[PDB]
RNA sequence: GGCCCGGGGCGGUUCGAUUCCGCCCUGGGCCAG
């Protein structure tokens, strides 16, 4: 039953003593190092508030800087500090560059920011993290394990991150929800009544109807914390809460096995579906996931849309990434359409336009039907693949700055066996609802 | 980089395009780190 299951679950989300101590001695050594240089800092993030999920230990140290400092000064002293304070350092880049490293074995993030009083005057998102901590540090005390269960849940089912690869619930959003509902269970029990029009103003301890799913930042009434959450993902969650409440289980907190299918079975299935299944392969632009994916979607979409307006009756799109390449997969209901198709002309009454409509020499001689003229034209392509090779070769520019640039220079369309050998059998099964 | 909203030019396609497919400049807003 519910309580039972949550009890054995705490064992998958709560970090064990050796993992907790390791983090401690790290926080310990790090505080020492920063103090021996006396820098004005503050630990924030799930580690600060002991809400981090077992296996995801990371300390996030924030360096407070005067309001007048020029951004550049913040990066330079920020880089300097991290340098002298870390065992190993490697510069990373978000809205502004920062340093990421390791101390006594654990991950550490060193982010520069402005020490400020009162939400406005914030220049970057980083400048808000400090507040979010101050606001969260007092109210979350005594619920960490709830935050954890809830993170483990979302993670287990692939919707925990808030980056563009997941488009799920950011950690902050998670804690914000525990603070509102009081515990994991109350959260799950209430999410079942969530709609795409639901608003959640933690600050006013209220819930209302809006024009989109909106969780208002306690610190900033205009910022939506769940801003990046995909409508579908929001759905999957509600549905996950309804199923969990109906039949609790520990399986909801255990990641689902990759479950890979032998290419031969997968070939039969597509044969059984009798659809056109092909992919568009091209070299992965060497860029960060936050830019790669929003592009892959655009790409997948433009092509999906080229496909349906072209009457190839697309059923689902999908994409995958690799160190090596990128695959835009598709499945159409039409392997081959006719060459002739009908075009709509003007109404018989409109002599002018009709005349011009007939000035176009065509191979088939247009006819009348229901008052207006029609014509028979010939397609430039007759299969989905044939068409996608056309759309891509000429519209690459509209498939995302980077993705589109790599497609322009090189890309190929795959299919058949040659396809179930590529590193994409998994997505294809998801795309096709393959089960068992 | 992506999304949203808005200006000024174009190209293609069409009997017919502000209205489909796209490209230039270009103003504001938002998202991820």
From Swiss-Prot:
Q: Which GO terms describe its biological process?
A: RNA repair; tRNA 3'-terminal CCA addition; tRNA surveillance
Positions with a binding annotation for Mg(2+): 58, 60, 109
A Gene Ontology molecular function term for this protein is: CCACCA tRNA nucleotidyltransferase activity
Residues annotated as binding CTP: 46, 49, 132, 151, 160
Q: Which cofactors does it use? A: Mg(2+)
Q: What is the effect of changing residue 109 to A?
A: High decrease in both AMP and CMP incorporation
As its record notes, the protein acts as a catalyst of:
a tRNA precursor + 2 CTP + ATP = a tRNA with a 3' CCA end + 3 diphosphate; a tRNA with a 3' CCA end + 2 CTP + ATP = a tRNA with a 3' CCACCA end + 3 diphosphate
Q: Could you tell me which Pfam families the record lists for this protein?
A: CAA_C, NTP_transf_2, tRNA_NucTransf2
Q: What is its EC number?
A: 2.7.7.72
Binding-site positions, ATP: 46, 49, 132, 151, 160
Primary role: Catalyzes the addition and repair of the essential 3'-terminal CCA sequence in tRNAs without using a nucleic acid template. Adds these three nucleotides in the order of C, C, and A to the tRNA nucleotide-73, using CTP and ATP as substrates and producing inorganic pyrophosphate. tRNA 3'-terminal CCA addition is required both for tRNA processing and repair. Also involved in tRNA surveillance by mediating tandem CCA addition to generate a CCACCA at the 3' terminus of unstable tRNAs. While stable tRNAs receive only 3'-terminal CCA, unstable tRNAs are marked with CCACCA and rapidly degraded.
Provide the assembly information: Homodimer.
> Please, what other remarks does the record include?
A single active site specifically recognizes both ATP and CTP and is responsible for their addition. In contrast to the eubacterial homologs, the specificity of the nucleotide-binding pocket is determined by both the enzyme and the tRNA.
Record-stated family = Belongs to the tRNA nucleotidyltransferase/poly(A) polymerase family. Archaeal CCA-adding enzyme subfamily.
Q: Which NCBIfam families match?
A: cca_archaeal
Name it. CCA-adding enzyme
């Amino acid at each position: 039953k519910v309580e039972e299951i949550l009890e054995k679950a705490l064992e998958l989300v709560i970090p064990d003593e050796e993992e907790v101590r390791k983090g401690r001695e790290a926080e310990e050594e790090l505080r020492r190092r920063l103090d021996e240089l006396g820098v004005e800092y503050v630990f924030v993030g799930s580690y600060a508030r002991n809400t981090w999920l077992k296996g995801s230990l990371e300390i996030d140290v924030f360096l407070l800087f005067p309001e007048e400092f020029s951004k550049e000064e913040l990066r330079e002293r920020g880089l300097e500090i991290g340098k002298a304070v870390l065992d190993s350092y490697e510069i990373r880049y978000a809205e502004h560059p920062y340093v990421h490293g390791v101390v006594k074995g654990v991950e550490v993030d060193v982010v520069p920011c402005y020490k400020l009083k009162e939400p406005k005057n914030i220049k970057s998102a980083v400048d808000r993290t400090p507040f979010h901590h101050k606001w969260l540090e007092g109210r979350i005390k005594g619920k960490e394990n709830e935050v954890r269960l809830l993170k483990g849940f979302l993670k287990a089912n692939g919707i925990y991150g808030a980056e563009y690869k997941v488009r799920g619930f950011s950690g902050y959003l998670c804690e914000l929800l525990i603070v509102f509902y009081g515990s994991f269970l109350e959260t799950v029990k209430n999410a079942r009544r969530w709609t795409r029009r639901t608003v959640i103003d933690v600050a006013k301890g209220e819930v209302r109807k809006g024009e989109e799913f909106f969780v208002v930042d306690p610190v900033d009434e205009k910022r939506n914390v769940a801003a990046n959450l995909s409508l579908d993902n929001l759905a999957r969650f509600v549905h996950l809460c309804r199923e969990f409440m109906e039949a609790p289980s520990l399986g909801f907190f255990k990641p689902k096995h990759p479950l890979e299918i032998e290419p031969e079975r997968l070939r039969k299935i597509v044969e059984e579906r009798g659809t056109a299944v092909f992919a568009v392969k091209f070299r992965k632009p060497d860029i960060v996931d936050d830019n790669l994916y929003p592009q892959l979607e655009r790409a997948s979409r433009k092509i999906f849309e080229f496909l349906e307006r072209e009457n190839f009756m697309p059923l689902r799109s999908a994409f995958k990434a690799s160190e090596e390449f990128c695959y835009l997969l598709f499945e159409c209901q039409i392997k081959e359409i006719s060459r002739v198709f009908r075009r709509m002309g003007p109404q018989f009454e409109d002599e002018r336009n009709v005349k011009k409509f007939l000035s176009r020499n065509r191979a088939f001689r247009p006819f009348i039907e229901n008052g207006r003229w029609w014509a028979f034209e010939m397609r430039k392509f007759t299969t989905p693949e044939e068409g996608v090779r056309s759309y891509a070769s000429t519209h690459w520019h509209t498939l995302g700055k980077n993705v589109g640039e790599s497609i322009r220079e090189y890309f190929e369309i795959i299919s058949g066996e040659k396809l179930f050998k590529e590193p994409v059998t998994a997505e294809l099964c998801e795309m096709m609802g393959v089960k068992d």
